[PDB]
């Protein structure tokens, strides 16, 4: 699985667009979405830093997409190519393995 993080500037509609856009990018089985608001809940619950994010004037977290590759695209070179595909959809910030 490669995790991609969205630009924080995406509104509700624009986020919905990115979600629709990555449904059938080559080599991707499924993509899981976490809200800015859900991502924040998850840090406060599970990081053991409590409200450290909450203490900022702005939510510093983006809404996020976890790319689950198809079983025939789980090899080293497969993951590199499908990672390179995400780069061509402008509006994603960072891609991690």
């Amino acid at each position: 699985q490669i995790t991609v993080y969205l630009q924080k500037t995406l509104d509700d509609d624009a986020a919905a667009g990115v979600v629709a856009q990555l449904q059938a990018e080559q080599g991707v089985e499924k993509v899981n979405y976490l809200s800015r608001e859900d991502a924040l809940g998850e840090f406060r619950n599970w990081s053991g830093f409590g409200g450290a994010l909450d203490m900022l004037e702005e939510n510093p977290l983006p809404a996020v997409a976890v790319v689950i590759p198809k079983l025939d695209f789980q090899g080293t070179e497969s993951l590199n190519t499908l990672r390179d595909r995400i780069t061509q959809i402008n509006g994603i910030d960072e891609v991690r393995m």
Partner: protein, 380 residues
């Protein structure tokens, strides 16, 4: 024979005493009105600079108060984050970063820690930037306050010069009001005052001639260069400065009420009316408040700004072709000899310099070295 001879020599002594006491009071009046004029001009220029500086200082204090509010808000918000971090044990008990981690939840939980560390870096950078803008605007404000204080110091000095000169003038005029001037020596002073004024204008003119003659030549070259334009089937557009040169040197033209009123007010005396005995007014007197701005009637250059007995502070503006406008009785000359002036520009403030009974403007137009009725140039 003995005591008639004592009284003859004590009646000539008494006339040479009266004449020299008067001469000395008039030289004091000249000096006082010169000081009132120079100080009135400075206080005017000073006050105008100050009005600009005070507006800047007001704006800077408003801008600094805004940033100071911002800085206090940013400090309190930052301090609340440090406090919450400390209550969390983030500074010792980081341990909760380690034992709380999963396969993919821990992946995101790391990314999230990256966005938090970034946000904290930005918070501190924002406050650092607010403190730098504040400190800089305060440095700039202190330099403007220092400039303002030097100006208020100049205002104080000039005001002191003016107040002194006014106090001393009250005493000189009371003195001059004591020396009753009989009919025939008034007429004598009036004729001699007119003659001295004539000599002062000629000397101012003599000193302007080189410049006046060059500018006239240069001005005609423009009119000429527009002949080659017309007579060779084109138009030459003279520059804005060539247009100014032609205006300043072309004279006042035919009297058609085209010139600016130097001041507006009741006409108290007209050219040709009786001045005293057989002496006639060579100019007009327009009544107006002390300090009323005197306007140049037309484009030209100042060639005289002197105190002259009977006329007080006199400004003469050269208009070219031997045409001059003359402005007397002034409180203050607002322009120096050699300064170019624009139609409608303030050149003086109305007063009663030279010992007039009321504030007014003395106004002449001269052509060919002769005062003429100035009335028919006045319109706008």
């Amino acid at each position: 024979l003995k005591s008639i001879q004592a009284d003859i020599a004590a009646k000539e002594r008494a006339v040479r005493q009266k004449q020299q006491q008067r001469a000395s009071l008039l030289a004091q009046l000249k000096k006082q009105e010169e000081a009132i004029s120079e100080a009135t001009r400075k206080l005017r220029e000073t006050q105008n600079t100050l009005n600009q500086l005070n507006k800047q200082i007001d704006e800077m204090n408003a801008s600094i108060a805004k940033l100071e509010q911002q800085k206090a808000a940013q400090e309190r918000s930052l301090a609340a984050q440090l406090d919450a971090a400390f209550r969390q044990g983030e500074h010792t008990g980081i341990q909760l970063i380690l034992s709380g981690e999963e396969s993919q939840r821990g992946q995101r939980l790391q990314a999230y820690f990256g966005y938090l560390n970034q946000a904290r870096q930005e918070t501190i950078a924002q406050l650092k930037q607010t403190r730098e803008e504040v400190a800089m605007q305060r440095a700039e404000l202190e330099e403007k306050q220092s400039e303002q204080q030097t100006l208020l110091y100049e205002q104080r000095a000039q005001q002191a010069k003016l107040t002194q000169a006014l106090n001393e003038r009250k005493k000189t005029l009371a003195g001059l009001e004591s020396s009753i001037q009989q009919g025939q020596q008034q007429l004598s002073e009036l004729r001699a005052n007119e003659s001295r004024l004539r000599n002062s204008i000629a000397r101012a003119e003599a000193a302007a001639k080189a410049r006046a003659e060059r500018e006239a030549r240069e001005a005609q070259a423009v009119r000429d260069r527009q002949k080659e334009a017309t007579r060779k089937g084109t138009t030459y557009k003279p520059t804005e400065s060539e247009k100014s040169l032609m205006s300043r040197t072309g004279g006042l033209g035919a009297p058609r009420g085209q010139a600016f009123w130097p001041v507006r007010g009741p006409t108290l005396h007209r050219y040709g009316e009786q001045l005293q005995g057989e002496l006639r007014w060579k100019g007009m007197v327009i009544g107006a408040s002390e300090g009323t701005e005197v306007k140049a009637i037309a484009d030209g250059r100042v060639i005289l700004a002197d105190w002259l007995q009977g006329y007080g502070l006199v400004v003469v503006v050269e208009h070219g072709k031997g045409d001059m406008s003359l402005y007397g009785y002034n409180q203050s000359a607002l322009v120096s000899v050699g300064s170019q002036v624009r139609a409608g520009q303030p050149i003086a403030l109305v007063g009663s310099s030279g010992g007039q009974g009321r504030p007014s403007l003395y106004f002449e137009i001269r052509r060919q070295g002769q005062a003429v009725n100035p009335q028919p140039w006045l319109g706008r």
